[model samples]
Target: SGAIYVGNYRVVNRHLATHNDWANLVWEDSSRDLLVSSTTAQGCDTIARCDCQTGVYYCSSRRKHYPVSFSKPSLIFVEASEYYPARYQSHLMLAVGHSEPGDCGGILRCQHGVVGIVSTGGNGLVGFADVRDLLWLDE
Candidate 1:
């Protein structure tokens, strides 16, 4: 099953990062009944946003948001690719080969919580907007 568009919310604003590679949305009248999940915890042993170690991360595409559609792939940190116009310290370098269309804006979650959201990918690497940075931006 898919999430139904009940016209209960609207995009109030679009916050784009200074470098323009990543952006997030603000919604008005968003549904409170929808399922929600917790974000990564501070000072926890979970994977750091900039961690370069190899480990398994979970992701889901925008078009398919189902438990069965989730992809759990082993990934590692790498250099940001030239496919992006500019890189920022808030950007994360993920070893590529797991990205698909409509994957941008999807969460990259570890066993604990979400680490980042997919921004862009190409040339054997993918980039994510760190959740910490996104929180700062939201403030």
Candidate 2:
């Protein structure tokens, strides 16, 4: 039931990482007018927009949009913590603090542009698939 359609775009494919808890959805637009722009997580403070039940969109009812500030990325523990192992591949995903359990597939944006897509979360940590790693799927 994660499927969603916005305007002329709809999710046509879903990608999930094999070893880590991260994923991305491929959006297809029939008009081909909405092209995705490239961007990266420069630091914390990016905006997260999702349609989880707790989010403003109220996934259980209707689709809406709202923004929440991202606290950090690649965090394992809130305090006295360390980054995830390099083998886990930091480049493939980013993390946020304000997301809820059903927030996966949420959109992460910043002043620059789109950064990533929500994939996993728990214990105050939300994981999103980096947009850079999501490029190959369209090719």
Candidate 3:
């Protein structure tokens, strides 16, 4: 239910030993039928961006030379009437709530590219690599 307007992406050098399982660093781009799920705190989920005029990687954030309308930021999983208010209903969204603290969830928003991951936390288990990698605040 969304597409177009690409501008928010800032997932460099995450903390605490970095390197979380990026689920094999997904990639696909069937001519705008895009899908590129990359992550980086270190230790490669996927990082190889050469040939920006052969500038080649000198740590240009692993320089996967993108600029043909660079698109690689998508992870949607939101659908509960699109952001609550229907008496707080949910089919997804409940985690990021550190150890059963006040257990109430539902908050995922990423514009222009995609990054939606609704929740329904810990009835027993919770681990999608601890909520992938997403951070876009006041950008």
Candidate 4:
């Protein structure tokens, strides 16, 4: 990377320098937004945060805030757009590596008594189809 602390950056920088040409575009601050993801994730310690101007791209992950770099405007938009993704994107996504035996369900309960169920594999292996059995994909 001609820099430090990044995995793929070094190889990429070396590749780009070998040709001495611009490396099109790449996402910035690539390391910060990694998901801490866990149903047991306690408070902000497991979340992410952002700090960008009101007009500029802004996002928040949990508690810690960070500024989105101007260079990766696309990344900021695409990433932020995910939270408000189209009308409903629930049906288009899936969670990998869910709860294990003896582990509490990945599902959660809200303060309002709402359930945040994780819709992973089929239940009973043959009950309902589509969203008839979906618990909670969102609030």
RMSD of each: 11.8, 12.3, 17.6, 20.1
| Residue clash pairs of candidate 1 | none
Clashing pairs in 4: 1-10, 48-61, 48-62, 49-64, 49-65, 50-65, 50-66, 51-66
| Model 1 accuracy (lDDT, Cα) | 0.34
TM-score of 1: 0.38
Greater TM-score among 3 and 4 belongs to: 3
Candidate 1 residue-wise lDDT, 1-139, digit = tens: 1111112211111122222211322321111111212223322223233333233433464343222122233333333333322323333445454665345555455444445445555574554544422322222
What's the residue-level lDDT of 102 in candidate 4? 19
Stronger candidate by lDDT (2 vs 3): 2
TM-score between model 2 and native: 0.36
The TM-scores of all predictions, comma-separated, are 0.38, 0.36, 0.16, 0.15
In candidate 2, which residue ranges exceed 4 Å CA deviation? Answer: 1-90, 133-139
Q: What tens digits encode model 4's per-residue C-alpha lDDT throughout 1-139?
A: 1121121221111111232222422332122211111132222211112222111111121122222111111111112222232232221112222222112112222222212212222221100001112222221
- The lDDT ranking, best first, is 2, 1, 3, 4
Which wins on TM-score, candidate 1 or candidate 2? 1
TM-score of model 4 vs. true structure: 0.15
For model 3, the stretches where C-alpha displacement exceeds 4 angstroms are 1-8, 11-119, 127-139
Q: List the residue pairs that clash in candidate 3.
A: 49-64, 77-116, 92-119, 93-118, 93-119, 93-120, 94-119, 94-120
